[PDB]
Enzyme design. Sequence first.
Site, PDB file in Angstrom:
ATOM      1  N   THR A   9     -34.875 -14.746   2.694  1.00 35.55           N
ATOM      2  CA  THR A   9     -33.428 -14.804   2.332  1.00 35.55           C
ATOM      3  C   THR A   9     -33.107 -13.844   1.191  1.00 35.55           C
ATOM      4  OG1 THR A   9     -33.189 -17.129   3.014  1.00 35.55           O
ATOM      5  CG2 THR A   9     -31.541 -16.269   1.478  1.00 35.55           C
ATOM      6  N   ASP A  37     -27.867 -12.047   3.840  1.00 34.40           N
ATOM      7  CA  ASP A  37     -28.404 -11.702   5.155  1.00 34.40           C
ATOM      8  C   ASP A  37     -28.230 -12.898   6.095  1.00 34.40           C
ATOM      9  OD1 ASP A  37     -30.612 -13.280   3.966  1.00 34.40           O
ATOM     10  OD2 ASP A  37     -31.709 -12.646   5.760  1.00 34.40           O
ATOM     11  N   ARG A  82     -30.822 -14.123   8.450  1.00 34.59           N
ATOM     12  CA  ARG A  82     -32.090 -14.579   9.039  1.00 34.59           C
ATOM     13  C   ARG A  82     -32.550 -15.903   8.426  1.00 34.59           C
ATOM     14  NH1 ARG A  82     -37.394 -10.660   9.188  1.00 34.59           N
ATOM     15  NH2 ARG A  82     -36.163  -9.745  10.895  1.00 34.59           N
ATOM     16  N   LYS A  89     -25.125 -18.137   5.764  1.00 34.23           N
ATOM     17  CA  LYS A  89     -25.607 -18.588   4.455  1.00 34.23           C
ATOM     18  C   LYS A  89     -24.509 -18.657   3.391  1.00 34.23           C
ATOM     19  CE  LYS A  89     -30.097 -16.530   5.472  1.00 34.23           C
ATOM     20  NZ  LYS A  89     -31.320 -15.903   4.905  1.00 34.23           N
ATOM     21  N   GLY A 117     -33.721 -21.130  -0.284  1.00 30.66           N
ATOM     22  CA  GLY A 117     -34.638 -22.264  -0.388  1.00 30.66           C
ATOM     23  C   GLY A 117     -34.556 -23.134   0.851  1.00 30.66           C
TER      24      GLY A 117
END
Lengths: 222, 226, 196, 196, 125, 233, 204, 195, 195, 212
Positions: B1, B17, B19, B33, B47
Amino acid sequence: QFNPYGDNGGTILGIAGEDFAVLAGDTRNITDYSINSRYEPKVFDCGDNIVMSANGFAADGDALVKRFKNSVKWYHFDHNDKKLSINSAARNIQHLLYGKRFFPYYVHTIIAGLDEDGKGAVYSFDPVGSYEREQCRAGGAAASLIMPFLDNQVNFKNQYEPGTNGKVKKPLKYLSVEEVIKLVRDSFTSATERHIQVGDGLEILIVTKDGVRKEFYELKRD
Amino acid sequence: TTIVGVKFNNGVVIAADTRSTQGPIVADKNCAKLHRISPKIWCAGAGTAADTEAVTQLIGSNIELHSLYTSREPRVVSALQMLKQHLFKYQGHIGAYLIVAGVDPTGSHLFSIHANGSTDVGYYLSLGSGSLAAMAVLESHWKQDLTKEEAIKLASDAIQAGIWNDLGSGSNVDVCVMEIGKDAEYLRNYLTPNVREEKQKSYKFPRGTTAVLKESIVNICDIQEE
Amino acid sequence: TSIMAVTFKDGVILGADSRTTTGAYIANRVTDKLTRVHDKIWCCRSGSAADTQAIADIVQYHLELYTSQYGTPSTETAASVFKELCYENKDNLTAGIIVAGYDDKNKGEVYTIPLGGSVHKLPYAIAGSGSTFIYGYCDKNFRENMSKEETVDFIKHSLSQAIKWDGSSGGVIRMVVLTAAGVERLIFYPDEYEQL
Amino acid sequence: TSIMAVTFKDGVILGADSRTTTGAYIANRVTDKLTRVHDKIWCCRSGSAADTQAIADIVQYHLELYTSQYGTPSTETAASVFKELCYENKDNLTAGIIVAGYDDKNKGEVYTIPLGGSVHKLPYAIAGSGSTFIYGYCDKNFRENMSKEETVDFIKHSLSQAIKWDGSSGGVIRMVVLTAAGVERLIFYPDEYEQL
Amino acid sequence: GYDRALSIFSPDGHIFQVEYALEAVKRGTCAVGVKGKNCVVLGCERRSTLKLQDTRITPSKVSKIDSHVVLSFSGLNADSRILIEKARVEAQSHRLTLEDPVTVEYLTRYVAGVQQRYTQSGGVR
Amino acid sequence: TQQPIVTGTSVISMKYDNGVIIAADNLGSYGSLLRFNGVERLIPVGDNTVVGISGDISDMQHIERLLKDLVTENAYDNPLADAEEALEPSYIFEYLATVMYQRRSKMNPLWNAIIVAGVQSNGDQFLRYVNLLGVTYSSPTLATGFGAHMANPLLRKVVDRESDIPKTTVQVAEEAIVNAMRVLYYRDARSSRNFSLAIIDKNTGLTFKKNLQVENMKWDFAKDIKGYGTQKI
Amino acid sequence: SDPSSINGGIVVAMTGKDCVAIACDLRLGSQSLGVSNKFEKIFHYGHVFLGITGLATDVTTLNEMFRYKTNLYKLKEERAIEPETFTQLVSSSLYERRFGPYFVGPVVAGINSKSGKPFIAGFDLIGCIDEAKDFIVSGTASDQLFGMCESLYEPNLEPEDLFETISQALLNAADRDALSGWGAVVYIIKKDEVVKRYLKMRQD
Amino acid sequence: MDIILGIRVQDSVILASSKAVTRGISVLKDSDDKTRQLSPHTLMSFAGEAGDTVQFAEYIQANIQLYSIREDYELSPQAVSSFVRQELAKSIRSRRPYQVNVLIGGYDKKKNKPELYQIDYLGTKVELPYGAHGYSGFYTFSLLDHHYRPDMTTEEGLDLLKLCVQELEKRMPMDFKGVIVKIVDKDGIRQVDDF
Amino acid sequence: MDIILGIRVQDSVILASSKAVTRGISVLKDSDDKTRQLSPHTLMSFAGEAGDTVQFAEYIQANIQLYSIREDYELSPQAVSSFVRQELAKSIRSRRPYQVNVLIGGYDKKKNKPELYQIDYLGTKVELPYGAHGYSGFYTFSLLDHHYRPDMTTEEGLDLLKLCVQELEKRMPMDFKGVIVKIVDKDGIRQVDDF
Amino acid sequence: TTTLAFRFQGGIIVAVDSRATAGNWVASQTVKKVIEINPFLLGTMAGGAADCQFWETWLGSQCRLHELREKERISVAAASKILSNLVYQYKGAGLSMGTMICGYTRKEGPTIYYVDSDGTRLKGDIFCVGSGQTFAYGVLDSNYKWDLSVEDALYLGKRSILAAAHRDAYSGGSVNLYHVTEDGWIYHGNHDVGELFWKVKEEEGSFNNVIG
Ligand SMILES: [Mg+2]
Ligand SMILES: [Mg+2]
Ligand SMILES: [Mg+2]
């Protein structure tokens, strides 16, 4: 406490055709979450129409390939320049690996070439030297992502002929070199999407009676 | 992350990002995110993914009730205080690492939050496995008095550094711009530099390829009349 | 961390570096470790950043409620509130705090609260990982009843050395001056203090 | 241990405390940590007393045999012999040694050999548990080309502070002066250096 | 919790709430018990003010506490269910710990104990 | 098996059109104590190679002595020691890589990470890495420790693949390296301001720069930062 | 010892043109010992389908828990729960056991009855939602499933073509996992018809 | 304890359970009955940690007997097995879990069908034609996979069970001192006193 | 392996040894002979770690056979037992010790007396009227302490041995698959083929 | 893994599965678990794949040297003991083997020795080794007779591996059959378990628990 082993990632794939063989591998080298190199060759021409890759801990991998290349050289010296056949190379590699049974080379080895009848050949090894001739073998990080796909698309597993409903299997028709390369490229493209350690580039070494040829293809760099 | 936050002239921008991973496996290639705490307070989380989403929604819920109770638009310092005290109480066990940004009647704000409850203030911040790659870009190109266009550029460039260099990060760049006196603009998939190439082969099967033992209609309807 | 507080003729000054660390990575190079719990009662924080922030927030709350009921608290009272939290929760905390404040009756005072939660009233105090390297220097160079300019120089020189030898310390040197005149913030950059 | 060696205009001086410790018990309060491996090549010892005594005895043997064959060894040569023993036996040793010597060609030289077995040539060196507390003081107060009296004062003041803060250090301050004039031993008692 | 002392003594030494509970029993349908030489019979009255009743499913007046003991009652029907449930639970508890079913006297002593408890406990009738 | 005691941090490097650049700071740490401030961690071998070393300093000094002995040994009975039979970067690397792998195989490693930078006889750029495990790899940019995490991303923006090397001048490359060293000083707690830099060019040879400093640092913005959340004063 | 791989099993879900598909194997084991070949892992509450992999006692418990909750939902709301809403309920329910979690890997599949839009979602054991457009995988052969789906899948497949794709994805993944197999089921789901097909596969 | 087996045939369920009880070094008893009757047409066998086995079994027995008296009705085997599963699924996240594995053999009088349920201490339930706990299945399942038919008589089931016990007595290291065998059918529960 | 017993009567020594070989989960063999003839009038039984038992026994056998050929003479049971003790006492301070316990039953042709020696893997030797290794003695010694007489016949010894094996089969948890019994007397070594 | 070998009237039947696993991951379905030591001797693979491969082809070399030196076929007793004595030298170092050395000579007849990496060497009639050994033992013990025909014995070995392949998660792939005679071993083919299971289910009436 000192740990003599590491993990450099990487994924390799060997397929045996009717009169050819390919050994492919990604060019990315890593430790933990970092990229060491986007192009670090992993599949090597070892002479006598044999290609080799030792995937896993790169230090052990480089050491093993180096010692085998050396073994080919001394085979020529000791036995009147006789060509080292793929089966003989395989047995020799077993002894190189088992020699360190109690402090092993932390690698998964694959070699490819042609047998003495001109037919395609691939051999696969565990870290301590157990080996098998195989038609199809992926190794390393994304091996678990690639092998089931190959079972289905190379060996036509779980595929039956339409209309018969499970009674007649799909016949195992031979694949061309162009067809195999298509499946190799799609295997690594899919592995790149779902495995973080796979990417950057794909290098394929093709072995025929004419010799060893190379092909390179870009992979996603994220 | 990889997540970043960058202050500019009249506001603040955050980016991330897309992923999300399970060990070395990519679970989702287009993950979201950037979370909304309130209309003009957004945060990005690294996390434990469930923790960052859960702690955002709990505080976001309580922030909304607080806003209704006080008849005032929510403040970033309120979100910060509520997040840190919640995370401190759980002694780090709730694995939420957040960059909290927003605009409110007091002005524009940018904070970060570690899972154990520690907070910091800054003009530019980065968190996650790709934070070192991102911070390298931020430390190389950040200046005082950035424009909106410059800050968006810098933030996405910092995420790209994470995408290309950190194995824990990849795929696309999401951005959210929060400017004073304006609606916050959420730019989902602001950059798309990782489209998969066409495959060499179609893997559509002939119909009847799979062996079948039994077929049956499943009753999804309720008990019928008559 | 390299932190210190020093009493002088007109009051007290707090000093600190600006480095916050998770391992060898500098997670923040411009941190503010000088924290306000009341108008003229501040503290220096060392140890877990989560712990010392949580403690300081609770103390600020306690002194705000004290002020509403009983008027301005003494520096001794502020130190006692810090101690109570640090002593009673010693098993679960990693905090080393220096409390500094200015009264008009008591003038400048410094209290240090180490790991155990004990209290020690001192003319000056040093703490943090970087303090180990300046025990010798500070003991030789401290005098009571220094001027403002002398005290700024003493703290600047001391923390300069602490930063020079301690990898965990670095960045800018922040200072907060507490006198009858009010509250003054100072900052000193690397190009200044490195050549000392 | 608090030990140091300092080069100056006329040569080099070695300094040390006199405390040996097994736990909190002072097993010897009048220890001599300044050790002779050659006429004008001495060393300061820190770490395991067994290890540093064994090493120093072997070095003295090596340099005695060197002298019989090749004449007086250089300080660099003595440091190299120390390094060879400390590096090659790093797994089994706990030794931190400072080597100091006087040539007529090279004058005063100081080499420090920390735990790993690396060598570092320096104008002056400090080592031992007590050295941590005087990094700041020594860096601020050291000058090149000091006089004999200035260097004695620098070492006396430095080790005084190291002793003051480090419980492992104490007793008398011993010193050995290495110049063209010869070898001089000095001793300074608590009543002298504590009031500095 | 609600703690009010509902059952208390009066100047003449009576507890009226207990005595009024007996008046509720007086209102209930008649129940009778007769023991022979080798059996016991329980008879119960059903008031015929209620027809259009479904007798298959309507609660019966005699209840099995265990396979060997039965209980009938006169008074509040809803109250009796609580005593029956408690008695059934105690019967299974006795089998579980003593490894023997309850005697009729023991089961009686238990139910009677529950009734007494509700005459000097706060907040209950 | 041991533990590193006195240690050196990042070494960083990259290729450009006519050669290679390598850099490393001058600090020898003793845990968190910044103990030794004048340590040279770039060691030139001849006029065509520079070896950069991080990790344990005692082991670095040992490797330094091995390289010194290698030059002596190569000159023995060798009339072309300063011409056709001089030490190549590739020879020096392979030797070190052999030693590192052998030492890890006896469970007694040299606790280092090493980058060999140089130019070959035919003008080709040489840049390759080796560490305590004997692991080796090459790339247009290479860095150790913290440098791997922070320098590489910056250097890869200049040279992202092989085809970017001819398009990169020595001025652009040195600029990128110097900037990376500044970023490492901002963010690595075991780094120092003072560093050394070496350029090996196929036309102008070996340029070794000592006593360089990190400059043009941004710190002014620190004055506006107050508290950790709610504090205004 | 690892609770998520004591019993074994897999689930996969996919989207197509105006349809969704969800499939699972039928094995339950005690580590190496195969115990049952009829342990179905896909359940449905109205038109919303839920697959669950992992520790089998938790699989059964959670099915009973979501049947409980979707029944009360329907009584109060006077309508069947939708896939988007049910996804949030699964997430909420898992996170309430944050520090003592159910060791499972749930998968939701269904079509929204009002918009007609196909929907799928996946979760980790503690509630994090993965809402993919293409496919979701879960279980002890999730790596293998990721490999199959990534190459075999293409968007906008017709129901009968989607059946072949998801079936081949499951079968070949299961055959590379020791703790998966012993039979398989595939659900093809359209807006108002659902077909259930049991597949013939190797029984080792 | 050790070996517990179960087999569902045409019209009955048969449970076989070992007789030995071992306190580490010595075999304290060779006639132990590892079963409890939950209701007239439902039997439960058990094996696991000492003490917990009997405590759990008797607790379940008490609860089902309580239900039977309250409702004047026998719960179906399926309903009893679900109750037992929930108790074990509750137990596994307790302070000290019941370390008990069970087989539940019952005859459903409504459907006129025998039913066998296997439940482990985690609360893992499966309905089976034949089942076991521990290592018992490792020795016996290959024989049951070969010979089992759904239309078997009770006598054929007992014969297939004898073959299973013989294989256990040959290849198992522990002496489990034979088995007690009980049959559950439409007429209730009975013990085969010669086996 | 498991149970090995020995008893010295008037005119012979009798050794009894179990037949089972278990490799963890399964009993691989039920006819294993845990003994080696060292000389015509000396027999050694053994039990301990797998592999080491047979390796040690055959090594001792080879050495005694070598002595017999070299000197054309049979060593006394006492002399053989001393040789064996020394080998084990040497072994216990080796890199990898022999984990083997033995009984040596011999008839001394010079003294016309039977002799039984018990030696454990440490090299602890004792001459006994009756002996055992492992847990075997815990079950059998109370019976031998009661019934044993020094003037017993071979038939009486076998009967007392049967009582010992019966007690083992009753109270031991492991199935050791019976015992092979061998008699050592003036005429040599013979096996009792029905026991 | 499941490997078995049993003695009968017509010699020895050797039967093995083909599966190799790394945790839950199925590495191979095409592993050769019968090692062809020479044209007269067979060895089975269980435990360590390399240990078994390496040391049993080594055994073949030692057997070849024996018959060159002694001008006579090596006995199964002597061949098995060469291997057991070798692994006993390595005891403690971590070798992993469980193998059946199978042969048919004039002096011995059909002979099987179980050889173990902790030094065990047992002669016997029926042996079964691997994670699925218990399942195969069940079918073997209840159907074994000395007077089995070659055809029926071959099937019994095939059926016993199938039983293990079905129940044991770590056994499967395909079945390899061998028949060892005095004149050498004869290979009786590779049989995919997938196809074999359905064929046996229909023809035998077994596995009624499984729907087909
Ligand atoms: Mg990436
Ligand atoms: Mg002292
Ligand atoms: Mg299987």
